[PDB]
């Protein structure tokens, strides 16, 4: 939950970042830990909520 | 690094009072004169008040080991993990490198 | 993993699993009226969430702009020796 | 020697001091839901209000700016109607932010009350009337002094802080905490303010400064190792307000037992008080030249004329004691600005008038008797805590001005659950030690932590008694 909140705050202060770049950075450049979650949606209006 | 940039750019002074949770007798170790054992004339200095804070469970360190662990080692572990994460490198995948 | 266009044996597999005391997990690929790339990526994400080492390099390409992300959210606790 | 050692150890066992522990800046969280910000109309859109509104706007919440007139801030019913109409037809508030304490003005018609305390009381009891479940945070400016670098704390915001302290116990859910701010508005300070305001809890009494963030906490302060300087030998006239009362009588006889020249007692009744004749009899038997008075202390003309005529010419006033105050018990649900006017008349007005009429004659000391309720806070001490809280701020103001002021905090005199009584001789000796150690704001209470700590924690979870090892031991025991 802390990771999700931190990512939300970080993305809030960013001028429309590319969602695919964020997806690649999260998938490749981060360790996969035990408790996992995912967000899959085709429009950049539901990802924030 | 962004926090450091915010601090220096705003011209904020980080000097503050001594820590009180470290067992220091801060009330009884201040006198004005410059020559006395066990006493100092400085009220304030930079400090990490969360120096003892450490995520022991993340690195597989038990609480009893962490209590008997130098704060320098804990801070260096956390800072190294953060630095590797900020470099675009997965710290777990650096194993054996 | 059910490789169908719609799960049909998910109920039976779940019933067998819960009636055995095993922590197995069941997933499907597509569903009725949902067969675009969005549903495929949803299935892949669910499989990864359950702990399958999905190769995201194929899905998301080989290399993109190095977007910067916040570090891990450490849940720190105080450890200090008393005097 | 054995008696002296034992009593000195017991005396130092009951010594304490309030201070401000620095702490790590909280990471903060997102401001969920809608937040109701209430601001004075006098401030309008100036410094702190616009910046805190912007900070909560970027925090994820939606600000609701609600300017309030100074007159409107007094009445609870009118203020509650203002809240209802401003917030009406919308979501209920997740939290409430009160900038009302930032107005440095007195209530018209009740000149001996500050607008800040009345406005805060009106806001909290109006929120009680509306039945809202929101958590209330009140912000102050220049209310406390974390260290010597700060300027002296002002009286009215200190009274607000004491009011909040007492309110936090009887209404744990409604009242959340207090957050002092520096004199000058800044975006970084506002960001840290919204960060701490969204925290889970525990950091009730905190203060923000350019140096950082601090949390108010209480520590032990034994005076065994501190050298004695300027031993208490009052030579001239000693003015004691409310000498005919209990604490005043005890202080008067303590003055009589050594270093007594002329005990100028002042009381509303004076001779008519129940036992004045006996008290003056023993005081004269101990060689004290007693001279009681029958006049209210709040009246400036009365005390001015009393100083002019009742002071012997052969004994200028050096020591002054203020321990006179009407005990108007009341609950937060039944407070009104007239009651605060009656309570805050005697203490604050008398202290200010005594200070003002002085400055033409040197003073050895100027003692003030604040209560434990100012420091800890107790349920039911709503009408009584704020004046005691303002006494420390007044003493700090005068100490910065360069006068020998003291704001000694007191417990329960032998003449509650957990707090034990204080003996006359032991309390007087502790007061002597405090004066001859030059304590700007000592705290002289005795308590059994094994019961008091668990009782206070049950009343409200807090991290005030963290640096006392006995408190931690009691907390872990339960
Ligand atoms: N404004 C004032 N001017 C003079 N005396 C005052 C006063 N306000 C309170 N007192 C005195 O201070 C006394 C308070 O001491 P007390 O022993 O009566 O109760 P306690 O010590 O709890 O405050 C009051 O009883 C009152 O006695 P008089 O009314 O006979 O003076």
XYZ file of C-alpha atoms and ligand atoms in Angstrom:
738
model
C 0.000 0.000 0.000
C 2.872 2.375 0.768
C 4.394 1.580 -2.633
C 1.089 2.321 -4.361
C 0.669 5.620 -2.508
C 4.253 6.668 -3.252
C 3.854 5.840 -6.943
C 0.593 7.802 -7.073
C 2.195 10.861 -5.473
C 5.221 10.603 -7.774
C 3.038 10.365 -10.883
C 0.866 13.275 -9.720
C 3.823 15.685 -9.997
C 4.700 14.644 -13.543
C 3.467 16.174 -16.852
C 1.630 13.256 -18.475
C 4.275 10.498 -18.437
C 4.134 7.736 -21.016
C 2.238 4.773 -19.474
C 4.261 2.192 -21.412
C 7.552 3.553 -20.069
C 6.173 3.361 -16.524
C 5.027 -0.211 -17.157
C 8.446 -1.221 -18.484
C 10.254 0.437 -15.573
C 7.996 -1.257 -13.022
C 8.249 -4.670 -14.686
C 11.983 -4.810 -15.430
C 13.809 -2.434 -13.057
C 12.112 -3.516 -9.801
C 12.385 -6.640 -7.689
C 9.359 -9.016 -7.646
C 8.461 -9.508 -3.980
C 5.865 -11.771 -2.360
C 2.732 -9.605 -2.143
C 1.957 -8.484 -5.702
C -0.638 -6.345 -7.444
C -1.312 -5.234 -11.004
C -3.265 -2.578 -12.900
C -4.379 -3.395 -16.455
C -6.504 -0.870 -18.339
C -6.532 0.565 -21.853
C -7.290 4.216 -20.935
C -5.310 6.695 -18.829
C -8.293 7.778 -16.739
C -8.733 4.771 -14.435
C -5.073 4.168 -13.537
C -4.988 7.046 -11.053
C -8.171 6.034 -9.238
C 18.701 13.584 -3.771
C 15.471 15.450 -4.512
C 15.071 16.134 -0.799
C 18.613 17.498 -0.652
C 17.903 19.711 -3.660
C 14.722 21.003 -2.026
C 16.669 21.735 1.161
C 19.548 23.613 -0.478
C 17.391 25.424 -3.050
C 15.051 26.748 -0.354
C 18.068 27.807 1.725
C 16.848 25.826 4.735
C 19.112 25.364 7.758
C 19.008 21.783 9.047
C 20.732 22.570 12.364
C 18.501 21.537 15.266
C 18.631 20.443 18.882
C 20.293 17.308 20.158
C 18.453 13.964 20.069
C 16.610 13.023 23.253
C 15.879 9.326 22.551
C 19.540 8.181 22.532
C 19.987 8.190 26.314
C 21.972 11.433 26.258
C 21.764 13.576 29.401
C 21.285 16.614 27.174
C 20.099 18.807 30.045
C 23.188 17.956 32.109
C 25.856 18.197 29.384
C 25.696 21.910 28.548
C 27.697 24.646 30.235
C 29.008 27.889 28.673
C 32.708 27.574 29.538
C 34.944 25.987 26.908
C 37.129 23.946 29.323
C 35.327 21.196 31.238
C 35.278 17.385 30.787
C 32.006 15.862 29.659
C 30.471 19.264 28.838
C 30.038 21.192 25.593
C 28.858 24.695 24.720
C 27.048 23.660 21.500
C 23.243 23.476 21.662
C 22.452 22.362 18.110
C 23.892 20.323 15.255
C 22.803 18.248 12.295
C 21.325 14.885 13.224
C 19.442 11.916 11.793
C 16.664 11.482 14.340
C 15.573 8.362 12.407
C 19.100 6.916 12.552
C 17.922 3.977 14.653
C 14.995 3.349 12.307
C 15.665 0.307 10.134
C 13.611 -2.239 8.180
C 15.129 -5.400 9.629
C 12.612 -7.747 8.016
C 13.431 -6.597 4.486
C 17.034 -7.858 4.588
C 16.332 -11.022 6.585
C 17.943 -9.654 9.764
C 16.315 -10.703 13.022
C 15.404 -7.991 15.567
C 17.989 -9.181 18.096
C 20.753 -8.964 15.491
C 19.519 -5.529 14.398
C 19.614 -4.193 17.965
C 23.259 -5.320 18.240
C 24.059 -3.859 14.789
C 25.896 -0.614 14.138
C 23.589 2.162 12.838
C 26.183 2.866 10.144
C 25.713 -0.619 8.686
C 21.916 -0.270 8.660
C 21.994 3.168 7.043
C 24.521 1.997 4.460
C 22.389 -1.047 3.600
C 19.259 1.050 3.099
C 21.112 3.741 1.146
C 22.792 1.161 -1.099
C 19.468 -0.510 -1.879
C 17.934 2.887 -2.648
C 20.889 3.842 -4.855
C 20.670 0.606 -6.836
C 16.920 1.075 -7.274
C 17.393 4.673 -8.443
C 19.995 3.555 -11.009
C 17.444 1.474 -12.924
C 19.044 -1.727 -11.594
C 17.122 -4.392 -9.737
C 19.181 -4.898 -6.534
C 18.151 -8.560 -6.371
C 19.491 -9.243 -9.873
C 22.919 -7.817 -8.957
C 23.602 -11.040 -7.018
C 26.769 -12.691 -8.292
C 27.885 -9.545 -10.139
C -3.922 -22.242 -16.705
C -6.928 -22.712 -18.988
C -6.008 -21.854 -22.583
C -9.620 -21.567 -23.774
C -11.582 -18.603 -25.081
C -13.654 -18.779 -21.866
C -13.100 -20.655 -18.569
C -15.326 -23.727 -18.229
C -13.334 -25.931 -15.816
C -12.364 -23.158 -13.382
C -15.260 -24.050 -11.073
C -14.428 -27.764 -11.040
C -10.706 -27.149 -10.535
C -11.361 -24.724 -7.675
C -13.797 -27.174 -6.075
C -11.204 -29.947 -6.287
C -8.463 -27.693 -4.899
C -10.453 -26.414 -1.918
C -11.521 -30.010 -1.174
C -7.843 -31.066 -0.929
C -6.176 -28.444 1.287
C -3.833 -27.240 -1.472
C -2.913 -23.644 -2.307
C -3.151 -24.058 -6.082
C -4.476 -21.166 -8.172
C -6.531 -21.300 -11.377
C -6.462 -18.750 -14.201
C -7.965 -18.365 -17.655
C -6.872 -16.609 -20.827
C -9.982 -14.985 -22.359
C -13.658 -14.612 -21.484
C -16.989 -14.137 -23.225
C -17.080 -10.865 -25.207
C -13.510 -10.081 -24.007
C -10.817 -11.264 -26.413
C -8.706 -8.202 -27.188
C -5.111 -7.631 -26.099
C -6.442 -6.049 -22.898
C -7.871 -9.365 -21.702
C -4.680 -11.214 -22.649
C -2.589 -8.746 -20.657
C -5.053 -9.062 -17.773
C -4.578 -12.837 -17.808
C -0.794 -12.451 -17.948
C -0.879 -9.976 -15.058
C -3.030 -12.352 -13.006
C -0.623 -15.208 -13.734
C 2.322 -13.053 -12.656
C 0.424 -12.020 -9.525
C -0.060 -15.680 -8.624
C 3.724 -16.091 -8.971
C 4.428 -17.261 -12.533
C 7.643 -15.794 -13.968
C 6.087 -14.083 -16.975
C 8.728 -12.721 -19.361
C 7.620 -9.095 -19.561
C 10.393 -8.310 -22.063
C 8.293 -9.828 -24.849
C 5.129 -8.011 -23.752
C 6.585 -4.541 -23.135
C 9.491 -4.545 -25.603
C 13.214 -4.855 -25.036
C 14.190 -1.316 -24.007
C 12.434 2.024 -23.524
C 13.158 5.396 -21.951
C 14.627 4.899 -18.432
C 11.690 6.321 -16.498
C 12.564 7.035 -12.866
C 10.375 5.599 -10.103
C 10.311 5.987 -6.310
C 12.408 3.579 -4.284
C 11.035 0.837 -2.047
C 8.764 1.925 0.816
C 10.687 0.548 3.778
C 8.621 -0.217 6.891
C 11.232 0.886 9.398
C 11.276 0.114 13.116
C 13.448 1.551 15.870
C 16.417 -0.533 17.027
C 18.819 1.045 19.511
C 20.864 -0.207 22.452
C 19.811 1.169 25.825
C 22.456 2.673 28.127
C 21.971 14.529 57.591
C 19.899 11.386 57.069
C 16.711 13.463 57.203
C 18.243 16.049 54.869
C 19.423 13.382 52.419
C 16.053 11.610 52.423
C 14.003 14.778 51.966
C 16.329 16.113 49.254
C 16.015 12.818 47.371
C 12.224 12.914 47.720
C 12.182 16.547 46.574
C 14.219 15.804 43.452
C 12.073 12.727 42.756
C 9.109 15.047 42.004
C 10.899 17.513 39.688
C 9.930 17.693 36.010
C 10.172 19.972 32.988
C 8.371 20.344 29.666
C 10.489 20.409 26.508
C 10.298 19.842 22.747
C 11.924 16.672 21.442
C 13.056 16.960 17.805
C 11.736 14.146 15.635
C 12.108 12.867 12.094
C 9.903 14.537 9.496
C 7.011 12.231 8.654
C 6.770 11.143 5.025
C 3.084 12.095 5.002
C 0.229 10.719 2.941
C -2.489 11.779 0.519
C -5.167 14.157 1.805
C -8.220 11.954 1.304
C -11.672 13.452 0.946
C -12.726 17.035 1.598
C -11.147 19.217 4.291
C -12.931 22.188 5.879
C -10.544 25.114 6.423
C -11.919 27.936 8.600
C -10.118 31.292 8.622
C -10.747 34.686 10.290
C -12.189 37.434 8.132
C -9.559 39.837 9.487
C -6.772 37.746 7.956
C -8.676 37.374 4.652
C -6.425 35.984 1.915
C -3.036 36.975 3.300
C -0.237 34.658 4.363
C -0.895 31.317 6.046
C -4.508 30.723 4.823
C -3.910 30.802 1.062
C -0.740 28.717 1.320
C -2.319 26.023 3.507
C -5.316 25.935 1.158
C -2.924 25.426 -1.757
C -1.022 22.751 0.182
C -4.160 20.734 0.893
C -5.177 21.251 -2.746
C -1.976 19.569 -3.945
C -2.285 16.989 -1.138
C -5.195 15.304 -2.967
C -7.968 16.873 -0.900
C -10.374 19.629 -1.908
C -10.058 22.834 0.182
C -13.186 24.569 1.458
C -12.138 28.103 2.411
C -14.610 29.667 4.867
C -13.845 33.189 6.045
C -15.448 33.946 9.418
C -16.062 37.361 10.950
C -14.526 38.111 14.338
C -17.942 38.729 15.900
C -19.302 35.566 14.267
C -16.478 33.518 15.796
C -17.743 34.078 19.345
C -21.268 32.641 19.281
C -21.444 28.864 18.946
C -24.916 28.823 17.372
C -24.138 31.449 14.730
C -20.800 29.802 13.943
C -22.471 26.402 13.630
C -25.028 27.888 11.254
C -22.139 29.357 9.254
C -20.468 25.936 9.023
C -23.749 24.293 8.023
C -24.575 26.806 5.288
C -21.032 27.039 3.889
C -20.596 23.247 3.804
C -24.247 22.471 3.046
C -25.172 20.523 -0.086
C -21.901 18.626 -0.224
C -19.902 15.755 1.262
C -19.330 15.644 5.006
C -15.810 16.793 5.964
C -13.020 14.284 6.445
C -11.115 16.752 8.642
C -11.305 20.355 9.835
C -8.415 22.840 9.946
C -8.709 25.860 12.252
C -6.618 28.950 11.531
C -8.839 30.933 13.929
C -6.048 31.016 16.534
C -3.931 33.306 14.313
C -5.908 36.484 15.134
C -4.050 38.587 17.794
C -7.020 40.532 19.162
C -9.321 40.624 22.181
C -13.061 40.027 22.178
C -15.058 43.305 22.183
C -17.153 43.646 25.328
C -14.952 41.099 27.155
C -11.558 42.841 26.993
C -9.808 40.307 29.270
C -10.361 37.378 26.866
C -8.496 36.760 23.577
C -10.398 36.285 20.347
C -8.388 33.130 19.602
C -9.493 31.106 22.636
C -13.137 32.141 22.294
C -13.111 31.324 18.578
C -11.546 27.902 19.171
C -14.073 27.076 21.897
C -16.917 28.221 19.648
C -15.620 26.129 16.748
C -15.201 22.927 18.751
C -18.567 23.183 20.506
C -20.284 24.126 17.232
C -18.804 20.998 15.656
C -20.168 19.113 18.662
C -23.583 20.656 17.975
C -23.490 19.644 14.303
C -22.522 16.081 15.224
C -19.855 15.862 12.526
C -17.369 12.998 12.834
C -14.467 14.982 11.346
C -11.152 15.275 13.182
C -10.278 18.814 14.286
C -6.744 20.196 13.932
C -6.013 23.734 15.153
C -2.906 25.633 14.027
C -1.184 28.424 15.965
C 1.650 30.873 15.293
C 4.259 31.880 17.851
C 2.464 29.846 20.514
C 5.477 28.074 22.064
C 9.284 28.193 22.181
C 10.961 24.919 21.225
C 14.373 26.453 21.999
C 16.037 29.753 22.837
C 16.240 30.664 19.148
C 12.477 31.240 19.139
C 10.976 34.520 20.229
C 8.906 34.547 23.419
C 5.540 32.834 23.148
C 2.441 35.019 23.089
C -0.259 34.614 25.780
C -3.407 33.952 23.762
C -2.038 31.141 21.593
C -0.603 29.483 24.705
C -4.095 29.679 26.201
C -5.398 28.060 23.012
C -2.795 25.311 23.405
C -3.885 24.635 26.982
C -7.519 24.611 25.880
C -6.683 22.080 23.182
C -4.741 19.953 25.659
C -7.693 19.715 28.032
C -10.161 19.251 25.159
C -8.196 16.329 23.707
C -9.017 14.151 26.725
C -12.778 14.602 27.154
C -13.260 14.423 23.347
C -10.568 12.094 21.949
C -12.350 11.475 18.646
C -13.321 15.053 17.784
C -10.055 16.745 18.783
C -7.001 15.456 16.903
C -4.091 17.701 17.854
C -2.294 21.014 17.471
C 0.460 22.147 15.098
C 2.288 25.415 15.726
C 3.678 27.302 12.720
C 6.499 29.855 12.356
C 5.712 33.586 12.127
C 6.114 33.716 8.325
C 4.093 31.700 5.828
C 6.093 29.513 3.450
C 5.223 26.804 0.942
C 7.633 24.246 2.423
C 6.179 24.729 5.906
C 2.662 24.395 4.485
C 3.672 21.174 2.721
C 5.029 19.746 5.970
C 1.873 20.942 7.743
C -0.441 19.076 5.384
C 1.868 16.065 5.601
C 1.634 15.863 9.384
C -2.085 16.732 9.360
C -2.803 13.587 7.315
C -0.874 11.321 9.691
C -2.489 8.404 11.472
C -2.051 9.753 14.992
C 0.114 9.905 18.088
C 1.800 13.188 17.125
C -0.784 15.251 18.977
C 1.251 18.243 20.215
C 3.833 19.244 17.597
C 5.405 22.447 16.307
C 6.941 23.346 12.943
C 9.963 25.633 12.611
C 12.566 26.401 9.967
C 14.932 24.191 11.970
C 12.499 21.288 11.613
C 9.620 19.607 13.458
C 9.352 19.030 17.213
C 6.970 17.160 19.526
C 6.149 18.399 23.019
C 7.192 15.936 25.728
C 7.897 15.921 29.462
C 11.187 14.917 31.108
C 12.714 14.680 34.557
C 14.890 17.580 35.727
C 16.497 16.820 39.100
C 18.270 19.797 40.671
C 20.680 17.828 42.883
C 23.713 18.455 40.657
C 22.794 22.003 39.567
C 24.604 24.633 41.702
C 22.626 27.101 43.790
C 22.832 30.736 42.651
C 21.154 33.861 44.071
C 19.744 32.253 47.200
C 16.237 33.378 48.138
C 16.579 36.106 50.794
C 13.690 38.543 50.208
C 14.442 41.710 52.164
C 11.788 44.236 51.164
C 8.020 44.087 51.004
C 6.679 40.818 49.572
C 3.359 41.146 47.736
C 1.129 38.056 47.884
C -2.212 38.018 46.068
C -4.895 35.809 47.564
C -2.876 35.376 50.748
C -6.048 34.567 52.688
C -6.557 31.501 50.472
C -5.019 28.098 51.013
C -1.988 28.259 48.740
C -1.577 31.943 49.551
C -1.666 31.204 53.281
C 0.910 28.430 52.910
C 3.212 30.679 50.866
C 2.762 33.492 53.393
C 3.771 31.317 56.340
C 6.695 29.971 54.307
C 7.833 33.556 53.760
C 7.388 34.186 57.489
C 9.664 31.239 58.355
C 12.834 33.069 57.351
C 13.617 36.273 55.483
C 10.381 38.115 56.299
C 10.119 41.908 56.483
C 6.610 42.922 55.372
C 4.082 40.499 53.852
C 1.703 42.710 51.868
C -1.246 40.355 51.506
C -3.952 41.298 48.997
C -7.399 39.709 48.829
C -10.898 40.641 47.723
C -12.119 40.284 51.324
C -8.916 40.579 53.353
C -9.880 40.755 57.019
C -13.320 39.261 56.296
C -11.788 36.041 54.934
C -12.425 32.918 57.081
C -9.313 32.851 59.261
C -7.496 36.074 58.406
C -7.074 37.036 62.073
C -5.406 33.746 63.026
C -3.130 33.895 59.982
C -1.936 37.416 60.774
C -1.520 36.345 64.410
C 0.986 33.610 63.568
C 2.637 35.739 60.864
C 3.228 38.536 63.382
C 4.414 35.940 65.908
C 7.090 35.026 63.344
C 8.063 38.706 63.089
C 6.280 39.478 59.810
C 4.722 42.938 59.411
C 1.431 41.828 57.876
C -0.784 44.317 56.034
C -3.863 42.737 54.441
C -6.057 44.475 51.858
C -9.667 44.363 50.643
C -9.696 45.112 46.914
C -10.054 43.278 43.627
C -6.773 42.812 41.779
C -8.213 43.287 38.273
C -9.129 46.936 38.890
C -6.118 48.924 37.681
C -6.999 51.948 39.814
C -7.373 49.788 42.928
C -3.987 48.074 42.662
C -2.314 51.323 41.560
C -3.595 53.198 44.609
C -2.756 50.212 46.831
C 0.838 50.285 45.601
C 0.920 54.057 46.084
C -0.312 54.153 49.702
C -0.200 50.672 51.273
C 3.490 50.018 50.468
C 5.766 51.153 53.335
C 8.371 53.660 52.198
C 11.116 51.823 54.130
C 10.618 48.572 52.181
C 10.396 48.722 48.362
C 8.605 45.833 46.687
C 11.034 43.112 45.575
C 9.173 39.770 45.531
C 5.644 39.353 44.163
C 3.531 36.180 44.329
C 0.413 35.513 42.230
C -1.676 32.574 43.476
C -5.188 34.092 43.448
C -7.820 32.661 41.121
C -11.521 31.832 41.226
C -12.274 28.124 40.731
C -15.210 28.136 38.290
C -15.462 24.453 37.415
C -17.121 23.686 34.101
C -17.355 21.154 31.307
C -16.567 21.790 27.639
C -20.237 21.279 26.747
C -21.270 24.135 29.098
C -18.604 26.759 28.354
C -19.407 30.332 27.363
C -17.221 33.422 26.790
C -18.584 35.095 29.927
C -17.315 32.183 32.031
C -13.867 32.397 30.448
C -14.005 36.147 31.088
C -14.685 35.574 34.786
C -11.905 32.992 35.108
C -9.315 34.805 32.963
C -9.976 38.188 34.573
C -8.184 37.521 37.864
C -5.101 35.608 36.655
C -4.190 37.346 33.410
C -5.379 40.843 34.308
C -3.735 40.804 37.720
C -0.446 39.495 36.352
C -0.384 42.100 33.575
C -1.340 44.960 35.904
C 1.209 43.945 38.544
C 3.901 43.792 35.864
C 2.880 47.168 34.424
C 2.686 49.010 37.758
C 6.203 47.682 38.404
C 9.252 48.606 36.209
C 9.729 51.689 38.432
C 11.116 49.562 41.300
C 13.512 46.632 41.115
C 12.084 43.150 41.694
C 13.919 40.193 43.197
C 11.456 37.784 41.558
C 7.940 37.538 40.129
C 6.384 34.137 40.826
C 3.317 32.684 39.114
C 1.468 29.542 40.217
C 0.354 27.650 37.130
C -1.473 24.341 37.480
C -0.650 20.799 36.431
C -3.630 21.034 34.078
C -1.601 23.412 31.928
C 1.102 20.756 31.552
C -0.768 17.436 31.509
C -4.395 18.457 31.107
C -7.245 16.705 32.922
C -10.936 16.180 32.084
C -13.213 18.914 33.386
C -10.520 21.628 33.491
C -11.862 23.404 30.420
C -12.526 26.835 31.895
C -9.428 26.627 34.134
C -6.527 25.340 32.012
C -6.173 28.238 29.487
C -5.271 30.867 32.084
C -2.634 28.594 33.592
C -1.274 27.981 30.091
C -1.128 31.729 29.431
C 0.823 32.253 32.667
C 3.867 30.431 31.261
C 3.692 32.501 28.075
C 3.511 35.727 30.088
C 6.498 34.646 32.179
C 8.438 33.825 29.007
C 7.529 37.234 27.560
C 8.845 39.013 30.644
C 11.946 36.800 30.836
C 12.740 37.820 27.263
C 12.048 41.395 28.374
C 14.697 40.877 31.074
C 12.879 40.514 34.397
C 13.042 37.736 37.025
C 9.845 35.859 36.175
C 8.856 32.328 37.155
C 5.905 30.151 36.110
C 6.051 27.266 38.567
C 3.660 24.429 37.782
C 1.873 22.866 40.738
C 0.076 19.604 41.396
C -2.228 19.078 44.377
C -1.527 20.848 47.661
C -2.484 19.116 50.917
C -4.831 21.900 51.964
C -8.050 12.668 41.533
C -6.783 9.299 40.252
C -2.996 8.920 40.281
C -1.844 12.361 41.420
C -0.849 12.422 45.093
C -1.025 15.430 47.388
C 1.892 17.731 48.217
C 2.912 18.632 51.751
C 3.313 22.302 52.752
C 6.949 22.071 53.859
C 8.089 19.842 50.989
C 6.318 21.969 48.377
C 7.778 25.157 49.852
C 11.275 23.645 49.851
C 10.845 22.611 46.213
C 9.748 26.158 45.375
C 12.818 27.515 47.185
C 15.064 25.196 45.188
C 13.355 26.240 41.951
C 13.812 29.959 42.656
C 17.455 29.641 43.711
C 18.185 27.520 40.607
C 16.768 30.208 38.251
C 14.113 28.016 36.637
C 12.164 29.951 34.013
C 9.294 27.413 33.952
C 9.716 24.641 36.531
C 7.198 21.844 37.054
C 6.705 20.604 40.630
C 4.312 17.635 40.786
C 4.525 14.188 42.385
C 2.757 11.260 40.704
C 2.826 7.465 40.869
C 3.513 6.466 37.269
C 2.389 2.839 37.714
C -1.268 3.957 37.838
C -1.175 7.432 36.285
C 0.525 6.311 33.066
C -1.944 3.517 32.322
C -4.908 5.699 33.318
C -3.780 8.541 31.048
C -3.126 6.160 28.155
C -6.589 4.645 28.615
C -8.064 8.153 28.565
C -6.207 8.845 25.306
C -3.240 7.214 23.509
C -0.340 9.665 23.575
C 3.452 9.822 23.310
C 4.048 12.638 25.788
C 5.455 10.500 28.607
C 7.984 8.728 26.374
C 11.241 10.071 27.848
C 10.310 9.137 31.443
C 11.560 5.552 32.036
C 8.883 4.955 34.681
C 6.143 5.769 32.167
C 7.550 3.299 29.634
C 7.931 0.614 32.306
C 4.324 1.100 33.424
C 3.080 1.083 29.822
C 4.898 -2.168 29.042
C 3.735 -3.702 32.333
C 0.074 -3.441 31.297
N -9.083 38.957 41.882
C -8.796 38.617 43.183
N -8.331 39.600 44.007
C -8.062 39.194 45.291
N -8.184 37.989 45.873
C -8.657 37.034 45.005
C -8.979 37.298 43.635
N -9.436 36.137 42.992
C -9.385 35.195 43.958
N -8.919 35.685 45.189
C -8.739 34.958 46.451
O -7.944 33.797 46.184
C -8.554 32.738 46.883
C -8.220 31.415 46.234
O -7.460 30.661 47.138
P -8.522 29.631 47.873
O -7.776 28.813 48.869
O -9.782 30.344 48.268
O -8.966 28.457 46.811
P -7.675 27.967 46.022
O -6.355 28.250 46.706
O -7.994 26.672 45.387
O -7.521 28.986 44.600
C -10.055 32.952 46.801
O -10.693 32.282 47.843
C -10.141 34.470 47.039
O -10.233 34.799 48.325
P -11.003 36.444 48.585
O -12.176 36.250 47.676
O -11.273 36.461 50.092
O -9.867 37.288 48.079
